[PDB]
Symmetry: D2
Subunit: 288 residues, 4 copies
Amino acid sequence: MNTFGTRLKFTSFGESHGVAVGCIIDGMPAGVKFDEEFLQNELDKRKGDKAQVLSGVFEGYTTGHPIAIVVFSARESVARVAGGAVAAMLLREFDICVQSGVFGVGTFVSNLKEEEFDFEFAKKSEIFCLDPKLESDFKNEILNARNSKDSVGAAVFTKVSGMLIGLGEVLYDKLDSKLAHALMGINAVKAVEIGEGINASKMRGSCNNDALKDGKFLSNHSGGILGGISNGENLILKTYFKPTPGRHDPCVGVRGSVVASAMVRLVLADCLLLNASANLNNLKNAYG
Amino acid sequence: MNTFGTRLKFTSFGESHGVAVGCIIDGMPAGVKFDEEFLQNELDKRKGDKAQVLSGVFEGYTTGHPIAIVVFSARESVARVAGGAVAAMLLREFDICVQSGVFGVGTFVSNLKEEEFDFEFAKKSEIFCLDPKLESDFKNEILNARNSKDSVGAAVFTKVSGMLIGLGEVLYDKLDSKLAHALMGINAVKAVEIGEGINASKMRGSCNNDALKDGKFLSNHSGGILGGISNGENLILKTYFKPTPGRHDPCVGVRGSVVASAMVRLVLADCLLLNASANLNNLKNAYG
Amino acid sequence: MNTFGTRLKFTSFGESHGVAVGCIIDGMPAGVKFDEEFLQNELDKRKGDKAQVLSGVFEGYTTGHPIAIVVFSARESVARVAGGAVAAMLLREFDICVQSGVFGVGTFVSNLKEEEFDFEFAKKSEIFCLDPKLESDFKNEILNARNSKDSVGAAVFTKVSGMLIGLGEVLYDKLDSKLAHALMGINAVKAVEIGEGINASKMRGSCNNDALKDGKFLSNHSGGILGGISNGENLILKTYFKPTPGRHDPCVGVRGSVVASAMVRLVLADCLLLNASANLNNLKNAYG
Amino acid sequence: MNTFGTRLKFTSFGESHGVAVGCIIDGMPAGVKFDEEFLQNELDKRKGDKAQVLSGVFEGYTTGHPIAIVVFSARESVARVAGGAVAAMLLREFDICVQSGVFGVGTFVSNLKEEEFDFEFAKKSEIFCLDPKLESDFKNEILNARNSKDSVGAAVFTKVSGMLIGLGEVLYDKLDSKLAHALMGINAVKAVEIGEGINASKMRGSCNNDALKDGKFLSNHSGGILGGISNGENLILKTYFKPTPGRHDPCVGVRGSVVASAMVRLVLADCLLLNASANLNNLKNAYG
């Protein structure tokens, strides 16, 4: 299957000889400011090949029809990114921001606070480092791994802000499930964490519990998901990449962070449409 | 959505007042020895309410039609187990065995080898302990957490043996994806690992690489999945449960281990059918 | 597969011994006046066994969760009706009305105008006759077919009024497609017509063309669908039943008309939800 | 949605400016003699632009991966044909043949027997005529309709031979349903018949009943489908096209016959894969 998503179906098709890859995003609502720049830029982040929008858009706005795109087994990575880009366009309309970066490389793992990683620094970093104190070690560790004609794993951090509430189809299409599915699906990924993650297993209810009783939530141990639906809080997702199975990629977890973003994008933009008609009020409003 | 799976769709429906829950397994091939005992027994493992097969079976064998079952928001847990039971029946026909147990409770986390946990001991344990040296600490930790009117997290280990090769639909329905989706979807789950897991991120290619060149695979760092498809090796899956949000459940990760099994069951029995027609030879054989 | 629909999934499960059948409607928006009477009444139309709503509703309104129902291979017919009933509840909120009746029995086929069949008479008729001038012939034809220990076919007419515009997912989930799929799927059905039907094949563009240029549409040859999406006009659907393969059913096309309604109901209530997020404006409105 | 099918998903993407269209066939089993000629020829039948296979094939055989193809809102018709072509390749391996032709144009409707239409003549006809006695009238009727700057409807006949038994997922994915859905979905289609069709409604059980008791079936009133699953007999499908809404197309039902074939192809090749794992025996055989 080369298609992904319930309502916002993403499909990537290959092309032997690797001349170019391509994706199809179906399900995008009409009337969306199509920033073909933000698209082209995102594609430059991975392994950093121009994207050519074939349809679904006219006069700078989405038509509401399938948006075909071609960029010059295939290397799906390129497609996953294009598609995610497009989905971020619908996410911006709701001020939902998804960003990721490398916080661990080899035996070097930043021991900072989740909401303490420097995304500003990440954007300007050649490796998307989130801890400026270890940015030199990651590079060295990677370079060392390269020259040695070897590879090294990496730990990615994906944070999502401006989260709405109720995103996620409870029971068998929960936001964490979908996220886990899209992230584990990424090449080289061998583990996925949401919030406290593995550590939540070693805690007690009295320490993991996130209460509010008043305004918003106090603590965010949950990672931004409760019962499989988003609670409004930021999204704390961690994707761990194994070492790639100078040339080749001594640390694919770097390029992988860019893909982990695209995937989390597609999912969220997918739940966003799925949860549209979850309320009769919404529905009447939808039909005037 | 209360339905799950591509070809082997599992569906659970609730019943207010909690009188009883129910599930529907559609997609099961006809002619399968229906061990209604193995079903009833599995249901006794969780929180340890009789299962009443409504259809899909006749004269001890599956008819090939939807197998309705009723057991006395609902408590899906019971349903997920019934359904998984049924799927294990199809898995037995291929000698695929799925088993799980608790290896960590609170700050007590067994530091044994994956293929070293005692499943024999697990079966006889009231808490499915996989490390007999910590079985007393888990109990104590749980009891302590109970009396304190509090809860505690837990780390589950799911091992699958007799694995076939090629199970898993590459690209967007990979065996790890599906597994991650079904496991993260479980209540209280906040992390999922496959094989080396988070640790693979701190390794180097030269240490994670699983080679063979001759007979089977040497090392099993991959956890039994490569490229999203099973490679034959056992399945190393780890599900981390957070503390439940004497009465109540001071450690739902115990009951959760029973569910983590059912879910991994449904998935595997699902890929098993999906990968049926992946080869023209198979197909001709299928149609004589 | 016992599930039906894209967003509004209908699922019917059987029960050997025919003690009772059951259905599950998942996807229904929360906050919908649940008229359990209209449900119970519709069930009395077919072959004219009480319906017991198990969930999805609380205090007279839909919760937004799967609505389980049980009524006392199975006889799906009963389920299809229950499910359709529930879907009509969501359709009423938009004043979409779906009604059907028998207009042909055996060699007796009413030659009246589409928008001329008497639905008022149909409701009061024991056979849902739409042409009061042939109501005696249908009965006789049926009775004759009964006593003869034989069966007879029938032609059903389903009209849908208060149609919204844009219902239907263009390309491969068009409103006519879905309708054709749900109707042909009905037992005994061997033909399906939309509007002019077979006759449109013998016409010329200059006679089939439905223009407007001003207010609404002039003629309704299209049957209420253009390009696979509804245009606002009424829906003209015709389902032809073959003779059943005193006892037994000498003319199942009568009971079948009741089912043809339920099915057209499910579909429309399904496109209604699918077309919710087709517009960014709608979406923003949906999320306030 | 631009994707079609349960297991054999067909997807067509457009390209503004109409430079070219494209389709993706995912789900095709590996190891299938890819006759890129039969593909290119079929494309020449519609409106009678070279097809360029992008992937899914290597060394003349299908790899088992998505088969991308590009041919120079879009005009889906071209894509539907390419895709159907590919599916016929899998159908040939089971000697399932699907052929269609025009049997009615305007007020001229061949009154021959179903199994009496000349397909040999059809192949050589510029309009796929199935009744050589009316081939001059259809042409004239079409020409007349052209010069008049008008259009005319048409009646298509699709026959499928070498039918296997059991093709079709009972309940909500029956072979007739799928067929009705794929055919009604075609542009200009307003009616669909299976076997006796509308006429079966005017018959009596004693005349429609198809018995055997010995070898194969005696009569074929059913059209080759019973209970929603194929019974082995040929497939009798009729698709009625309305008049197109010298230039333009005065009778799109001609080109439409070529598409009605492709669609019936995709469906059958889809049920063929779906019904693979319907039997445990088949399954064991599939896995050796």
